[PDB]
Amino acid sequence: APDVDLADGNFYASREARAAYRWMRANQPVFRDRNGLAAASTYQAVIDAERQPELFSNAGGIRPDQPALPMMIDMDDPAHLLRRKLVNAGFTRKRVKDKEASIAALCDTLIDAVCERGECDFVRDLAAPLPMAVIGDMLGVRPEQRDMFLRWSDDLVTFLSSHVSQEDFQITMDAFAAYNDFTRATIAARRADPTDDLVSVLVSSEVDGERLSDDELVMETLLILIGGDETTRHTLSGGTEQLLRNRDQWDLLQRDPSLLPGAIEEMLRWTAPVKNMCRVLTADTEFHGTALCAGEKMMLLFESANFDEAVFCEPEKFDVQRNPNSHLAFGFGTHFCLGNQLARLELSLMTERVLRRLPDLRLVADDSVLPLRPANFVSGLESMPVVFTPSPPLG
Numbered sequence: 001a002p003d004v005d006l007a008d009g010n011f012y013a014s015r016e017a018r019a020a021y022r023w024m025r026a027n028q029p030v031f032r033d034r035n036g037l038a039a040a041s042t043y044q045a046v047i048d049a050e051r052q053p054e055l056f057s058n059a060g061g062i063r064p065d066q067p068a069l070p071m072m073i074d075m076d077d078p079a080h081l082l083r084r085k086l087v088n089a090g091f092t093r094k095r096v097k098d099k100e101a102s103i104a105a106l107c108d109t110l111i112d113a114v115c116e117r118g119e120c121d122f123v124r125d126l127a128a129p130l131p132m133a134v135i136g137d138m139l140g141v142r143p144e145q146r147d148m149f150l151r152w153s154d155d156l157v158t159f160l161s162s163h164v165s166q167e168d169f170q171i172t173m174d175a176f177a178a179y180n181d182f183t184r185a186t187i188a189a190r191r192a193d194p195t196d197d198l199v200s201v202l203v204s205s206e207v208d209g210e211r212l213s214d215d216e217l218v219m220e221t222l223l224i225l226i227g228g229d230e231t232t233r234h235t236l237s238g239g240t241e242q243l244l245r246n247r248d249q250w251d252l253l254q255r256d257p258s259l260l261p262g263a264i265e266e267m268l269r270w271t272a273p274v275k276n277m278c279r280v281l282t283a284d285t286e287f288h289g290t291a292l293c294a295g296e297k298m299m300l301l302f303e304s305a306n307f308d309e310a311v312f313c314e315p316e317k318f319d320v321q322r323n324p325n326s327h328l329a330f331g332f333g334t335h336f337c338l339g340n341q342l343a344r345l346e347l348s349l350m351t352e353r354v355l356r357r358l359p360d361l362r363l364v365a366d367d368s369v370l371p372l373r374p375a376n377f378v379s380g381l382e383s384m385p386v387v388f389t390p391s392p393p394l395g
């Protein structure tokens with residue numbers, strides 16, 4: 001077997017991870033790593049676990065060596081369902097679709113900031129700022145305070161993505177304290193004088209005589225911040241990278257905008273920014289050939305599932321036309337990403353504008369192998385230098 005530690009962020013920063021996944025799928029689909037940690041590597045195993053939440057629970061927390069927090073993603077039904085219905089008020093199909101104009105304007109502003117230069121870092125300048133600006137605007141964050149939230153988000157993702165030192169633990173707690181303070185200020189303000197922002201909508205949400213408490217509002221908005229920021233970033237950067245590495249794909253999209261929805265799905269399949277979520281076993285079970293024990297956690301390897309040849313023909317081919325494309329980047333089942341529509345909307349609006357406004361975009365070096373973030377949870381490109389013919393801003 002490959003000698004790997006699936007809780008080590010260095011594994012996921014390796015471009016040989018998919019080679020390891022390939023071995024797992026072919027030889028021990030429910031794999032145990034060098035330390036005995038169990039992981040579902042095939043699409044079939046991931047789906048089968050997702051469909052059995054009573055056996056494969058979220059209530060032990062979704063990271064391998066960390067306890068549950070009081071938030072939707074660390075809950076099982078029926079409690080989870082109530083929490084999700086409450087928060088869903090902020091993510092109805094209509095409410096998300098109505099953000100189109102505002103998100104488009106953010107995209108044009110971001111491209112305006114670099115279009116005259118002829119070069120930018122696609123990650124720093126386009127992929128990273130968009131998701132935080134979208135969430136920031138929902139949360140009432142002033143534009144000049146976005147970078148503060150970007151840092152807190154990175155701190156928290158880092159905490160979820162490793163076993164932190166004492167120092168980094170304190171940094172995480174301090175970031176949470178700051179987020180908590182900010183959010184409680186917003187909650188107090190909105191409970192008194194409602195606007196149309198996210199905290200306002202969540203405060204007014206009601207399900208079967210139940211409402212979100214201040215504690216729950218802090219936790220659920222935090223989950224939204226962390227869940228929707230760096231994930232979206234990595235699909236935007238890594239997905240655009242594949243368009244640039246395969247010019248035929250870039251060319252297809254540019255000459256046919258109707259192919260955009262399929263392109264976004266392939267970007268999602270390929271990038272799988274969430275590399276795993278954990279499930280805790282509620283009983284001993286024989287699962288796709290591997291004996292699992294009550295109380296242990298098993299990873300769902302979403303990237304591995306997304307490259308499973310049982311489901312995706314020639315999975316190492318990036319193909320924007322792929323149909324079907326039933327990837328698991330957003331998971332499956334009762335915890336299926338609540339923000340999936342918003343993420344898709346951001347990715348579509350920015351990609352449409354990149355294709356249009358930076359039509360000859362290319363990677364600084366076509367032979368570059370760019371670094372991935374060492375993290376065991378959410379990961380993608382650190383940097384992506386790109387060049388293009390300059391143009392005047394739209395303003």
Ligand code: HEM
Pocket residue numbers: 050072073074084223224225227228229231232235272273274277302328329330331332333334335336337338339340342343
């Ligand atoms: C490309 C971007 C994103 C990816 C790849 C992603 C991925 C995921 C995954 C894998 C899960 C857990 C699914 C499972 O275990 O089966 C999840 C859950 C969740 N996501 Fe996302 N996500 C993205 C963007 C967002 C955004 C923009 C939001 C904004 C709110 C968001 C909010 C949430 C929430 C609240 C949950 C918990 C759902 C539940 O437990 O019922 N995510 N996401």
